[PDB]
Amino acid sequence: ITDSLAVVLQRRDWENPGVTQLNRLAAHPPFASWRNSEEARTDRPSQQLRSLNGEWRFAWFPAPEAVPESWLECDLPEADTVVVPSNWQMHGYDAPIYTNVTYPITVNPPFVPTENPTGCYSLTFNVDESWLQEGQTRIIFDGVNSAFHLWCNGRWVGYGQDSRLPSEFDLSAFLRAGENRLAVMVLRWSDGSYLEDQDMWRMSGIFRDVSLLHKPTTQISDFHVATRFNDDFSRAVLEAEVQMCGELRDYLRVTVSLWQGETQVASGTAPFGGEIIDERGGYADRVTLRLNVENPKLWSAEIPNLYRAVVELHTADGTLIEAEACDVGFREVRIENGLLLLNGKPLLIRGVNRHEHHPLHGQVMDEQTMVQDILLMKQNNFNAVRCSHYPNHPLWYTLCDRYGLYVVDEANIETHGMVPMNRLTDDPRWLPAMSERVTRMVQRDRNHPSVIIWSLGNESGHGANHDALYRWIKSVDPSRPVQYEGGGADTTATDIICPMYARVDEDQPFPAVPKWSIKKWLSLPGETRPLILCEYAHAMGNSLGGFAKYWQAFRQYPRLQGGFVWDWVDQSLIKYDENGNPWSAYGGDFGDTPNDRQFCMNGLVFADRTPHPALTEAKHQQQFFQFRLSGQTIEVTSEYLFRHSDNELLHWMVALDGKPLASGEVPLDVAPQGKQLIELPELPQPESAGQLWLTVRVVQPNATAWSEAGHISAWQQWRLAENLSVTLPAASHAIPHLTTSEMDFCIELGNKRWQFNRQSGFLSQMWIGDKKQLLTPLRDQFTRAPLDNDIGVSEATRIDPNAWVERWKAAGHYQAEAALLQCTADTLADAVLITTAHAWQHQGKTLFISRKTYRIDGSGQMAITVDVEVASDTPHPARIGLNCQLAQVAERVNWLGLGPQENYPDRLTAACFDRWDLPLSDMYTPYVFPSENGLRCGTRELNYGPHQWRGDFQFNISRYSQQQLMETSHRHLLHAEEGTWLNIDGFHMGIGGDDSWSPSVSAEFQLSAGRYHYQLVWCQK
Amino acid sequence: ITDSLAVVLQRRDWENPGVTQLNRLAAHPPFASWRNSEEARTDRPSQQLRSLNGEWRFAWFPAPEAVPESWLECDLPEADTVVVPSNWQMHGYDAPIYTNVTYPITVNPPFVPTENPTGCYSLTFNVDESWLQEGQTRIIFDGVNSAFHLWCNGRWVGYGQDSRLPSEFDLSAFLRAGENRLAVMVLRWSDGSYLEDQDMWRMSGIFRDVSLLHKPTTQISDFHVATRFNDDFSRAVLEAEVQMCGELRDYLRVTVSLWQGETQVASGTAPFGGEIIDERGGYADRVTLRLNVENPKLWSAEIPNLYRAVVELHTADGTLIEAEACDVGFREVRIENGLLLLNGKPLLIRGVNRHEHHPLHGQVMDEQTMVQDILLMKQNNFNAVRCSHYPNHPLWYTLCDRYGLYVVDEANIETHGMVPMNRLTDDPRWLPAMSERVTRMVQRDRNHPSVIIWSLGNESGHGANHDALYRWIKSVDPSRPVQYEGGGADTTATDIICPMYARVDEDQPFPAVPKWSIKKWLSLPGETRPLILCEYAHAMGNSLGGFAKYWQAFRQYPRLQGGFVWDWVDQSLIKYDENGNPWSAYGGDFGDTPNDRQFCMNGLVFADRTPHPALTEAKHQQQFFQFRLSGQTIEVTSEYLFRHSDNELLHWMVALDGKPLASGEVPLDVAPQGKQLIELPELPQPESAGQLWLTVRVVQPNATAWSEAGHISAWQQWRLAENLSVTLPAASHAIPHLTTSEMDFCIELGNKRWQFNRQSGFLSQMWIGDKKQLLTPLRDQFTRAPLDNDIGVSEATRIDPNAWVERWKAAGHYQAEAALLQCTADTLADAVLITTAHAWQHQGKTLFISRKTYRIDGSGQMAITVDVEVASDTPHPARIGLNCQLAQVAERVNWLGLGPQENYPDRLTAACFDRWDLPLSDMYTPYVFPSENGLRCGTRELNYGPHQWRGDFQFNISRYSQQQLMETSHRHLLHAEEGTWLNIDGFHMGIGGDDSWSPSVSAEFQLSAGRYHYQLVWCQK
């Protein structure tokens, strides 16, 4: 009767920040109630802990109150069978909504909508009779988004908010023997939604595991591990505080054993009862053991040395009551004197921001995905990661612990969408709620060594509630620093200045919360804290430009400890068409409103873990070994702090314009932070003409837990010498014919035949025999299908006039109109001289002027010269080059230049000067929101079909027009064009990336010189 | 239905620290919602604010579950009409409990005993049709101890915890035009009880007020005032922050005017919408005004300069909506460099701790008791009060604002009875709960100028949760320092070392929570904070010894900025007898179990606000002027910080053994912290034997808010000179006759005859005429009727062998037997000489030995000479004197010694050397729990009836023997005895009082010499 939906829903606890839980067990580190030390030690699975993940009965409802009381007694009939864990939007119940800042619902704290997409989960399961004999039987929800009610065997059990932490109830007195039934009322929105406004898809459901744990009545109830070190780390104390629950008796004991493998390192035995604490006594129900550990093995991302701590609750005459355990990592995290030191040396954080996202599964994490992400990171020079923006699924910590990644464990608190941002964070009434998102996260995760930094949530501004909460952390877990970015990045509630998107060299003095140049920030009078970017470099689309700029400051300034890239994966979601063929969908593609489109895809890797090009930029910049060449002594520096170049070989190779002349290999013997002198054998020199390049690569001869053998860890390249070509070509054995008309000019030599259109002024066509080549005349181009950075936060509704695209559009770049000023064929000794001048204008403003001379010769080779003028008062061109569409459609592509991967000017460090040969396909980059791509800079020679082009250019080549890319919202809607489109640029503007909602391109990357000159040479084979 | 008791009651929210409120409005400074600015200005009462104080109907129940649904519907036939506010225990429903540490209920968080006295209150009242058209009507409960549920017109409204803070609910939608009825059910025990374990009687009910408030829909929802200053305090800035409720309309303005009396001083008008705060902007619904005030009148306890702030919420046409107001105090409170400064100068807290306690009303306060208390305090040289141990009735802040007291505001949080104390305060599950007990106090008291410091509660140990709360305050209100004594008095949760019971020069090195002497604490390594006692000079019964030692240090050590004495009033209650007489009762007398007896009475004034003699000692020690005499120049130092002696006459005077030879009367013109030179007129000098004494008093000719005319604020005496008596009493015209016999000797001289028992050694009897004089032979006395301090925490069931009494007991002192060692009468030339000797012994050990000589001359005068020997191993005796019971009973007492009030060795500074005459009755101290008392030190002459004792002794004289005192539990059970018991002490040991639960008499006051010599001269005139 008082279990009735009736009576229950009455209260509307989901509409009360002052009710966060109902009948909820205290938080705590992960338990398994083993009853065999050995297993516990070996982390063998627990017979006392049962998963209820799987098939389950679910049924969706528009709102709470539409639920029928029957449901508490018997399963509904239209109740579909579903899988748990899962997100119901992932099942087609409702739409997944992609909103950033803007709240999904209407802002009326603490009120939520009546139309409250409720989902009912149900489950029938049998309990051993043994479970009900003794012990307690509790249940666990690793995450239920957003809030829910719960019932067992028709009776009400409890309530709980906070989608990111576990909720546990004591089922002990409600289950009967054999057949039992669960009734879970997950509400979609609650007063707790006002605290989960993170930038990600908004979904629901029981998205993490569900389990059953049976503990004995007299049990272990919480435990903490602590490690103190002497001055040289040669010795540590392992301190354990153990708390029990149950009636205390003089026979109870507690042993805590430390294991290194099979070998028992230290063991301690003691009976309950703590030291005096106050005028009343101590905890009788606690005990602290201190284990003395000598010349311990330290944990780092560099070497994840773990131990196993087993905690046993037993009697004096040896009977074992139960065991628990955790991995132990001996590390000291300390901010000393402006520096964030780990085990004494000052860290350099090469990390990134990551969400729990699966294109397919929504926000359900699995062991495989986890593992995958990590190895990729690890493989790409990542050290650390941030749980942006909530505590993650439990296994995560264990993988980082085991594999070696520093984690910044972050509280599930984000109220971005409030005005001001502080509205709640600064409201005493929201104290309790936040409080619990902080306290429980700490109490659950505090034993993992990977966690080295606790965060207070994200963009919630700065409120008196953060100060209190941070004070709490400091008080309870002095082992780690706390940090929080809200309110200006330097508030009193952070131990680190941790801004997002601060620029290296340029300031953004916004009212109340500016963004000083990072280097500048450190010296602001007063200031002495380390600076570590909590978010920097927007991996959004074609991005990561300027990346190096960052890597370089980090390296020159001590107090700049690196930072976290935004972000790892594309929060894109899979959809299917009129033929069950899938495609990658983004915000509002689910009819979701309001939404924020592509804004959800800022990763370094596709949502399927296939990497984006930027990823290599990161990998090279983040590399652990640095080099400098001096004569033929290569000096190698270790950027490792703890480890030794003990699985690395140096590959060196000397080449002349793609031709290898020499190679050798050296094993690295650099200590962490150390140097290593390498002298190379008298290097070869050719009489032959062309650039000599030196390329070194670092290799991992042996596999690791996260890398393959022969994995390349780092690299670097130097141009050695240039041997200028002073050989004037053989003055062609014949001369070219010219034939004229009023329409065009035609040049003929062999089967070769060109033709210029006297009207228009461009090479309109060319034949190699009865075959034609162009489908499109060859004309100048000064635009580009805009990148995400170019567009930014501009929308047809609302226009961002400062955004590049807006600027170009406005200036008429996109709709210019050529004009033939001149076009002249002249005849020379052994050549033909075509000569043009065109003027680009929009509304009687000459935007540009392109002056040119084609000079065909008896070898059947034309030499294009271009000389453009750009008006000082026009937004600087995205680019400056030529383009055209050929007919050939060849399988490969081969050039002598940077690559093999897509490189743009402000992002080209990870690339190498070589002779690359790829499939055309690899020439297009499958960004989900089409835009200019696949460019390759620094090309000296291109080759496709029978044509070859030569000189100093940037180029790109696909079967998509710059214009097709630009009028297509999804990569899935692109269609190949008739032949190959070619873009040959003498010049290309930067890509930007510092952020995607304002102009990121740095001056040196902008094309603002007014005069450009470039040459080409086209020819065939 | 859902309103039903059953449904409601079902969730047992008073058994869950999670739910602490249900639908309660937020907190804020006192509002009245005046609809005329003048009334606001002048504080005239509000038509919009209605009191429900009065006659209610009430029914007591042994349990919440015993309540009958009906209740919600209709009142009860057997419901008693009762008054409100009140304490039901004050009525008879149940028994008040007087317990200290030990909780009233059984320790089992968050659980409460099933049997939980419950009180249903209900009330039928009328609502003005007008209140129901517009605005919001709400209800205020100023104090419901300890939890409650509310119903309106049979509907359920909400729930509240926290006994010492208002709970307000909007009744808006439950009020029916005309007759409404209230249904309140208060619970005696709730989980909130765990945080209210303060040492005091434990009662319950609706002990403060209940009002109705009518505010508009667009109203003022909170406002804080703040005041900055400049270096010299010549210009201040009053900054006011206004927040609102309702819908924001552009035509809304706010104006804050500052009045000083009649005269307007500053004004500000503006409209809503604050400065940019973060990425999202500012508060639209807030506004901040800054008014400049040149040379503000400053606020202090010396001079309460107060202004009036009116906050008007109006439209732009100048149409008023609502107005709010508060009194403003221009003062700056800072801890600069070790010192706690007020307005720039450093304080010296002359404080006391006070409880809201009325012998009759139980814990309901009234304005008249508040006033009294202040006035008495002020009169007695108190400066400050600490709200032990919860927020007080609102009026209390206002009287302090206006009269001049410094208040320490303290949270209603004390979990003393836990083990250890930290237990809940270090538990996050308890964070919200406490969070609210702090945050709400601040939201409410923050605007009073009297509050200079915030305290997180009392004796709750030190837990993470204090740290956070402490930081919370600092953040929210940096204008005040925070303090907490828990955990060692020096934790990170305090800005001040605020220990309790810390000894002046002696340390008490408890484990974990040592109590260093105060001089020494300061000087510990790293220590730099100021030191102020939260409790000291425990004033239980015959106490206050050593008080001066404390004063001396305060005054010598800068960082020792005084303390708060414990405590103000006696928590004794009034019981009635058979014949209808009242009598002070205490712990245990209401059949309370368990109870801490006399432990509830530690005050300076009886519960009837009649001073305890200790009062005077304090008043003198804390006096604002200090004296130094040199030659005949008095140098007055002023300890006032802010004010000049503008109401002070120094009256002076000189006498020889109570015979006033002289007196002047100068006018004090000393500035704060200045000196005044007082050269005295050539003072006489008589040839006569006697001591010449200089007394000086400082008088207040002008009556003040809290003082009459002719009130005395300071005093001091000095003996100036002694002319030695080198004269012998004339030739005895006669000689006494001795008549011998087996049992006795007799002396006769005229009508006077004396007899000494030859078998006992005592003067058995004496006659004047045919008038017997003694009722009890004059014998020797070593012990005393135990002071509370002598007893401590030694109970019958459990003995503390260190308690002084326990020691005297064990040693035999109380029951040793005399032993006639020798007794001889001899005949001198003109006198008779008696000579005795006795030994006192127990278990055959001589504790003491007294050799005497009585000697009678022709003058009719017996000079008694005494010489006592105390055994080294024996506990030093209490006293060393004689006693007997005379036959006469007189009306007055005259003596020339220290008076006029009870004074004791370690408590006599306040007393004065002079001739006093009082009525016997004034010579007994009505300590509720009877003990040695009324002593009078430094006597040189005492007269009772015909007798006259002469010499240098200490004495006391009542109609009660020490035995009575001893065996009598309450003063009311004391009966007068046949005659007059007299006690004449050559010596007395000090009273102690540093604390009442361990030895407190300083060595200097213990009779530890061995040999003691003294001599009387008994005679008649």
Ligand SMILES: [Mg+2]
């Ligand atoms: Mg809630």
Ligand SMILES: [Mg+2]
């Ligand atoms: Mg956001």
Ligand SMILES: [Mg+2]
């Ligand atoms: Mg409660």
Ligand SMILES: [Mg+2]
């Ligand atoms: Mg206490």
